[model samples]
Target chain A: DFQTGIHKIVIQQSGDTDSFEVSVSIGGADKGGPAKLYNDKGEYIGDSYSAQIRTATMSCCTNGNAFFMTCAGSVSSISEAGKRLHITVIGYIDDKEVNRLEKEYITDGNTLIETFSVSTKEI
Target chain B: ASDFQTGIHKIVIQQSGDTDSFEVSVSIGGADKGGPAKLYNDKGEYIGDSYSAQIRTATMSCCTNGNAFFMTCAGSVSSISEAGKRLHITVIGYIDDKEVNRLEKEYITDGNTLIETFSVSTKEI
Candidate 1:
């Protein structure tokens, strides 16, 4: 419906003349992942933790303005005794870093499904 | 009928996969109060689950004389993979040399879903 268990994070890259996408999935499913996620109401919502890119084709495209910059994604570390995870996404025109997106989440365990999500924008 | 006492039972949390094995501990309390189980890759990465329906069922029988802690495996995984491996976690509660509760969880692990989690009780029931 709206977005409670199954969430959609839109990373709209509006740079100079290029754009891309990233996909992520967590947990054991079958081929390899964690159990699927359900809401507090016990509804078959979606994966325990997974993300998708709404767009694909590198749009020959503005951080609001920039150049032939590109973005690469990576995971920093799973800290806090493994209960916490730190993810970082880096953007580059030639390479260093343009923008960065940092995301960290701890499982809910308050329910059957662990509450997790995806991200965008890195410096 | 007389042996049906319940409290925070002893819990066992373990990590199983294509990598190595390690012991994980979760602390629970007087309420549904509990500790988190942790899973790691050969390189020591994170993964796993928390409390669930089946876990509660096990806690009921695991009668103990002390607390009733629970299990919760925090953190999510990225699509990243480590040599393409799998992880399995076992969660169980025991008291009086008998099984009171038991359950298991899965993961890809170290970014591949091979870590683990738990659902333990730490109270009397």
Candidate 2:
């Protein structure tokens, strides 16, 4: 199974009670799995959202191409050629979705290091 | 009477000029005169002539490896995979209906070079 970060760390010994929300969607396989969210405590916190994968058996992973001019993703990705389609739905802790994506190092859900102000402690 | 024992089948001429649109056409038939040829151009007009020799389907080989004639010259070509798996081809030049000089044994020729990405599937032939 694919895995990313494990434990939540405290930035400082100072006590701060702020809850965070997160969501995840899985694609690039025979079929997409589902979308689930996590709370500040890092546990499943919301409804299980799901979507339909493409009809073709994906040859590669989330990075491989299955058709001429399309690609598959887990979000509400655009498909101009009807070749690429969304396979799953993911939600954030606030039940929010990514409206825009900018250039950033996307963590494969692994080895992610979370940082906070030295005064805040990660619950 | 002069009976070199022959007949005029067709006569054709083709002139190419740059235009905004890629409009072209062809027609294979004898005009008021006996001929079998076709002509194409940016304009919606056609011109033909009479000559000899029956023309058939011609094969076009786009820019392949280094070989001038991809089919017969088999040579090295660049392997640029990420450039896409296919290419869009257009006929910028042709010989579909060019008037060959009446023989006494002479020749006229037209050609074009095209580039494309190619793929193939195999089955028992």
Candidate 3:
């Protein structure tokens, strides 16, 4: 597997004690993998939050094309009664932290480093 | 052919990474009337040409010692300077007989130089 730090792509939003993250795995050997979700405590709370992963496969990962998966949806993480993170993951074939015009580096020199940042740690 | 420019059109297809018996090819407007493509020596000499009626394609051999491997071809070319008369540059990667990957883009033969990048990775093939 390609090193996580080399190809980590993540979108982070913090709300007091709660945070939301969306990640897409690049450089995987298989049809790639789906974009994942996490809470501030570094727990995969995919069941508790809402996510929509449009394309998550390594079909186009080989032959020097690093763009393998795409996740287009919204993720909500609850911290308190009304305080939460409502993050939208939009764009086709790319992982973007919504409302942020600047593109998050989903890849590094043909390697997808979009998921490595959040593979561990907080926010 | 009033505005057709006749000048030397050149294309260099460069490759890097794993390079085990790999061949890279570039087609210039294969579906239209354009210059033929072929192979050349690193010394900038004529080697060979592959011109089917449709388009001219140049197949260049790759390097093996991890150095940058590429092919360079240039010759006289002319085409009417029109909006729809654009030349399409298509680079195809081949491992033995299997065509692995390709990239297509638009190009103009206004000058004698155009550079393109085509990387070869058998591990992904």
Candidate 4:
């Protein structure tokens, strides 16, 4: 499928030759979305707070740690289209099936970096 | 013959969703796999220095919440090379796992960037 700017990211290296696997985990809050995103066909999607842990390592070649945390390689963060989704309901709605609406997104190297909408509402 | 190209390395943990339990469950290996990465203290160079492998899963749960998936021990790590990779991990949390809440199936991330993406399918306990 064509990338919509979320979920995964591109790993750019300093040198011409660099290859490895990257893993990242995160979570957070789900504030409300704009009128559009909430409507049948929304245009805007909001987000919640979250956290993450990420690491990238090389493949086993000649018996090393299989990881290069230094001059080895580097990876970019997730894009906005790829951030966690928390749909806030103005009314009372708890449909387990609603969670099925989850979508995956990818980044475009720029413009759409992964981010969240800080909660202004306090308990 | 046996010196063929087939090996497994670097297993990580990833999760998604709201919490009645913020539990993120994933595996690095399968069949003959199912283990974590070996850890160390960087040969005592740094008492707190550690490295955790990166991983993603088809499964989903509330891993960013506290108390949802708090099992004193989860998995094991076995495999070491020469670079001295050390890893010390416990589920760092962002939300409360036991609290009732409503959320959607979006990428569960650091609230800053989308690191990994996943979704949860609920079933009766």
Candidate 5:
């Protein structure tokens, strides 16, 4: 079932390779989406799969204190059947959710230049 | 029985040079209790009542591109024993409830430089 809620997706540089390690974590769930990566030629790369939850270092600046944020990442799929690499991100800065963003990229490049920022409203 | 969800208040002004006409449409009911101005600032004297004067001009640069930009203005009653007279205001720029800049200030104005601004925020339920 496709559900719409707050989800966390992370893409990090894997060691010194030109590839990236992608993962996602759904809210209130033990597992994430189906892990799959399709290139522009409809080919899958990287045999490594995300089975269990992993930890990563995330940081931010709030007010005056430096915050080291943490998030759980699991295996996730980005490219659909017969589609390009499209990703949608939903960000949050506490309980309040920020705006959603969608991006499409060509899978021909060895490295991807990407950045994401999250912000929320304060009552 | 009265059904109230949220209270929306508005204060508007449209006048030219040397004009003395203004309008204010504040919510009368709906579990709201906050006066626009508790202490009256008549010309240059501080009185002990609600002030019926307009501080900002009609074109006070509040809206941009047909959308009213959000702002936050906080003030305090700086009167001693209901006799002294002063108004302290602190402002912060906003856009759609998100803060954009640092704090702006206007301290101890005797109605000569009241520095009026519009803010949009919910104070209570």
Candidate 6:
């Protein structure tokens, strides 16, 4: 049920079509709800051409000496002709940037954001 | 006095201008040594001191995170120069012509080889 953006403006297009479909899904919740898209003139050209939604889940625990952190997530999307895309992720520890990962791939499939770990001293 | 050759070796001199008091420990638990290193005097020369005994016990849990798949204990080196000298370590675990984590280090000490984690997959945990 995590929703964002609107259909008032043109966000994507196919070959000769202006209308497109907006698909979204929140992690650990419902997914794949469609929304119609249209032009500013209120003219319905076609259904949405692409739609995407994603969510991330992270967990952290610590003992007296060292602290442990981890993150996992999934990204799902659909686009025209399998266009190449990129997903960038930045990890933070105590509001400090620790690492950044940028992944590039084709559209229309779910990418499994694998488990990552971080350790820090308790000081 | 067991001699080991045919693998990379690293010598971390803890103290400057002092070699007799420096301490060094090696750990090779089914892991790659990444071939021979510059510390070897010759190509097939025998390196490392003959140890009379060795004691290894679980120090502490260095890994706290769940996503981390591998935990590597950094090797220990003691008897280093109290004045602080220089050392070099270059260890690599390769797969299919690509290198992995647990690389080299510029220096080492008794507590230098702390516990660390490495990620092998995208799964967070």
* Best model per DockQ: 1
How high is each candidate's TM-score? 0.27, 0.12, 0.19, 0.15, 0.19, 0.25
Name the lDDT value of residue A84 in candidate 5.
Answer: 35
Q: Write the per-residue lDDT of candidate 6 for residues B1-125, one digit (tens) a residue.
A: 01111222222112222323333222211111211111121233433211110112212111112222122222332322343454443344322222333344455334332222222221112
Off by over 4 Å in 6: A1-55, A59-86, A107-123, B1-88, B96-103, B108-125
Residue B76 in model 4: shift from native, Å? 20
The candidates, ranked best first by TM-score, are 1, 6, 5, 3, 4, 2
Instruction: Estimate candidate 4's RMSD in Å.
Output: 22.2
Q: List model 3 lDDT by residue over B1-125, tens digit each.
A: 12111222233344332222122222111000211223233355644332101122344332111111121221111232323333444445433334445555554434432222222222122
> After superposition, which runs of candidate 4 have C-alpha atoms over 4 Å from their true positions?
A1-6, A16-123, B1-19, B25-125
lDDT of each: 0.30, 0.18, 0.25, 0.19, 0.24, 0.25
Cα misplacement distance, residue A54 of candidate 6 (Å): 9.6
TM-score of predicted chain A against the true chain A, for each candidate:
0.27, 0.16, 0.25, 0.18, 0.28, 0.31
**Candidate 1 residue-wise lDDT, B11-85, digit = tens:** 454545643322222322111212122222223333332221112111222122343222222222222354455
Q: Write down the C-alpha DockQ for each prediction.
A: 0.02, 0.01, 0.01, 0.02, 0.01, 0.01
lDDT of 6 by residue, A1-123 (tens): 112222121112122121111121101100111123233354542221111212232122211111222222222233344555444444333434555555554544432122112222112
Q: Share of real interface contacts recovered by each model? A: 0.00, 0.00, 0.00, 0.00, 0.00, 0.00
- What docking class should model 2 receive? incorrect
Is candidate 4 or 5 superior in TM-score?
A: 5
Worst 10 residues of 6 chain A by lDDT: A24-33
Instruction: Give the per-residue lDDT digits (tens) of candidate 2, residues A35-106.
Output: 122224455532111112222221111112100001112111111222222122222211223221221122
How well is each residue in B40-116 modelled by candidate 5, as lDDT tens digits? Answer: 12132433211112234432212111121111121111111122233323333333333344333333333331212
Displacement of the residue A33 alpha carbon in candidate 5, Å: 31
Scored by Cα lDDT, where does model 1 land? 0.30
RMSD score of candidate 5 (Å): 23.0
